[PDB]
Amino acid sequence: AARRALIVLAHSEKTSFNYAMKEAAVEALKKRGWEVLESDLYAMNFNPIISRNDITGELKDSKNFQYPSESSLAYKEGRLSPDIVAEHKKLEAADLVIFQFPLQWFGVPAILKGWFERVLVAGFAYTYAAMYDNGPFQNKKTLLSITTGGSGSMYSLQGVHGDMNVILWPIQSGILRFCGFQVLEPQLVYSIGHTPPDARMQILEGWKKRLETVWEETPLYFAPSSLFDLNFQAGFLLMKEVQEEQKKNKFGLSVGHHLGKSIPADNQIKARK
Amino acid sequence: AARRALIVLAHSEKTSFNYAMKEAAVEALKKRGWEVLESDLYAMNFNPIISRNDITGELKDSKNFQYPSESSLAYKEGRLSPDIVAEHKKLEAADLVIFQFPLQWFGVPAILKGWFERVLVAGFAYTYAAMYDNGPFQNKKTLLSITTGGSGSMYSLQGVHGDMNVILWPIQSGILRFCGFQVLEPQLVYSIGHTPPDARMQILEGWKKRLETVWEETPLYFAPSSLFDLNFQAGFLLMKEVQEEQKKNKFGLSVGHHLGKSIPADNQIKARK
Ligand SMILES: Cc1cc2nc3c(=O)[nH]c(=O)nc-3n(C[C@H](O)[C@H](O)[C@H](O)COP(=O)(O)OP(=O)(O)OC[C@H]3O[C@@H](n4cnc5c(N)ncnc54)[C@H](O)[C@@H]3O)c2cc1C
Ligand SMILES: Cc1cc2nc3c(=O)[nH]c(=O)nc-3n(C[C@H](O)[C@H](O)[C@H](O)COP(=O)(O)OP(=O)(O)OC[C@H]3O[C@@H](n4cnc5c(N)ncnc54)[C@H](O)[C@@H]3O)c2cc1C
């Protein structure tokens, strides 16, 4: 059941808790006989910006340059930048992809974003035909390990910043679910700048221990594609019948599919129903 | 009433609609006697990645390096990287900041995100004391001009991707409202790869015309800070009384503050109530 796992880290300092959280996981997975691959973006000095350099050879139409087309084509033609391929080879091998990073401006780190924008190529990572539960990565599992500066309360429903589930949605459903991944519960660590030395260790211990059975956890619930007429005809809308039935439901499905009703609960924070 | 405006563009090609949308705005504001400043990030070859190079001189504690502290301090001590200050000077002058960019992975472009993470320094852009409607930029107005590859329907409540409002929330409330900005209605252009030549022009015309009166539009509604006990004591929670009262309300306040109830409407797309 256990095999290869990819750990993507987005942090410049080796003295950070984010780096700790990194080694911990690596150390953990290894003991359980896994095979860990790493993409320490800051270390690799990975390139975040997307440009016509990601492609090799004739640019087809270098006049009215368009990245989406130029790249998915470069992909099939195997003319993609070597540093971008390097990653694909890793993704192709990883069964479990883990993203370690400090929450920055309600989102993912610039350098990480770029990895998404550059690595997750159309044709490889996704296709209008192969979206969400049809995505290419449906056999792989992924989760987010985040480090927050603010406090847990700040993200509660009555907190200043608002529901944390909303924040994760764009990342978990928008990028990972999109591509096909099975999104597991996110590892949330609030304000480590406030947590004392003890807790920090117990947190690393909890981390390690949670990894002993990551592969056996249930994924987060995202609205299944079946509920939609996935065609440019219907406009990719929730099927009339499904809308019909859903009318009898008091709750929405997921954060993005609240359907105007009350949003479930920790739909994006806890895996269950 | 009219004066300086900053336009930040995140697009590599000068042949893109996003570039069109950019000149249009510039051209428009200028006719109305504005003074336009620009930060074509790809052009400027702006640096997106955040690291200890953004600081000049002695790094205080270059042992357990921590970017939040090291930077806000470099800010006050005027020891910030020159390219980062260049922007600050622009922000300080701009009355209206407009962000033009193609939606990428349900978010902002890597290079743009970096600008956020690097330019919006603590002490200048925000402070735990000065957040949201207390933010430093409360006198400036901002809006997002986005270009989507997918179709409008795809983002509807019954669409594959889900409510568009959720997507914008992290950006509009999380970054812009946070810092103090008055967030105006976002300029949404869905799938221009499908819109015909005509529409494209009319869209640019609409754009132009909408700018003749941007400064007079009403901002989007975000839950006012007054509703919270903004202190590390209470944990920045919605005041008990406010919770009390809010109990009689059927709808939540904003996307992030849905308070478990039904989310208003185009709280993030249309400015009104
Ligand atoms: C541009 C930007 C935007 C941001 N936006 C947000 C935001 O929107 N919301 C928010 O909440 N926060 C935000 N932050 C703050 C950020 O989330 C925190 O600074 C970050 O998560 C802290 O994690 P870290 O791994 O860097 O750890 P560090 O700051 O280094 O802190 C780790 C702490 O644990 C100690 N430690 C390190 N290694 C170990 C180990 N192995 N064992 C035990 N103890 C150890 C360290 O000494 C230190 O006290 C932002 C920061 C930046 C720069
Ligand atoms: C990494 C990545 C992630 C993405 N993620 C998403 C996503 O999550 N959701 C999504 O919906 N899309 C996504 N996209 C697609 C992206 O949103 C579109 O490719 C982009 O918005 C198109 O805008 P553009 O300005 O580049 O225009 P272009 O692709 O260049 O297209 C402009 C069109 O208008 C024409 N045109 C150009 N200038 C003018 C002018 N002055 N007057 C009249 N016509 C003109 C052009 O000939 C062309 O047909 C992603 C793309 C990438 C590369």
Swiss-Prot record, chains A, B:
Catalyzed reactions per annotation: a quinone + NADH + H(+) = a quinol + NAD(+); a quinone + NADPH + H(+) = a quinol + NADP(+); ubiquinone-10 + NADH + H(+) = ubiquinol-10 + NAD(+); menadione + NADH + H(+) = menadiol + NAD(+)
One of the GO BP terms on file: negative regulation of protein catabolic process
Main location, first listed in the record: cytoplasm
Pfam families in alphabetical order: Flavodoxin_2
Annotated residues for binding of substrate: A125, Y126, T127
Region (Important for apoenzyme conformational stability): 224-273
One GO CC term, this protein: cytoplasm
Cofactor: FAD
Induction per the UniProt record: By polycyclic hydrocarbons such as dioxin (Governed by the aromatic hydrocarbon-responsive (AH) locus).
Documented EC number(s): 1.6.5.2
Signal peptide residue numbers: none
Record-listed N-acetylalanine modification sites: A1
Keywords, ordered alphabetically: Acetylation, Cytoplasm, FAD, Flavoprotein, Isopeptide bond, NAD, NADP, Oxidoreductase, Phosphoprotein, Ubl conjugation
GO molecular function terms noted in the UniProt entry: identical protein binding; NAD(P)H dehydrogenase (quinone) activity; NADH:ubiquinone reductase (non-electrogenic) activity; NADPH dehydrogenase (quinone) activity
Binding site for FAD: H11, F17, N18, Q66, L103, Q104, W105, F106, T147, T148, G149, G150, Y155, R200
Phosphoserine PTM sites in chain numbering: S81
Localization, UniProt: Cytoplasm, Cytosol
Disulfide bonds: none
Positions of crosslink type Glycyl lysine isopeptide (Lys-Gly) (interchain with G-Cter in SUMO2): K250
Subunit architecture: Homodimer. Interacts with PDLIM4 isoform 2; this interaction stabilizes PDLIM4 isoform 2 in response to oxidative stress and protects it from ubiquitin-independent degradation by the core 20S proteasome. Interacts with TP73 (via SAM domain); this interaction is NADH-dependent, stabilizes TP73 in response to oxidative stress and protects it from ubiquitin-independent degradation by the 20S proteasome. Interacts with TP53; this interaction is NADH-dependent, stabilizes TP53 in response to oxidative stress and protects it from ubiquitin-independent degradation by the 20S proteasome.
Function: Flavin-containing quinone reductase that catalyzes two-electron reduction of quinones to hydroquinones using either NADH or NADPH as electron donors. In a ping-pong kinetic mechanism, the electrons are sequentially transferred from NAD(P)H to flavin cofactor and then from reduced flavin to the quinone, bypassing the formation of semiquinone and reactive oxygen species. Regulates cellular redox state primarily through quinone detoxification. Reduces components of plasma membrane redox system such as coenzyme Q and vitamin quinones, producing antioxidant hydroquinone forms.
Family: Belongs to the NAD(P)H dehydrogenase (quinone) family.
Name this protein carries in UniProt: NAD(P)H dehydrogenase [quinone] 1
Species of origin: Mus musculus
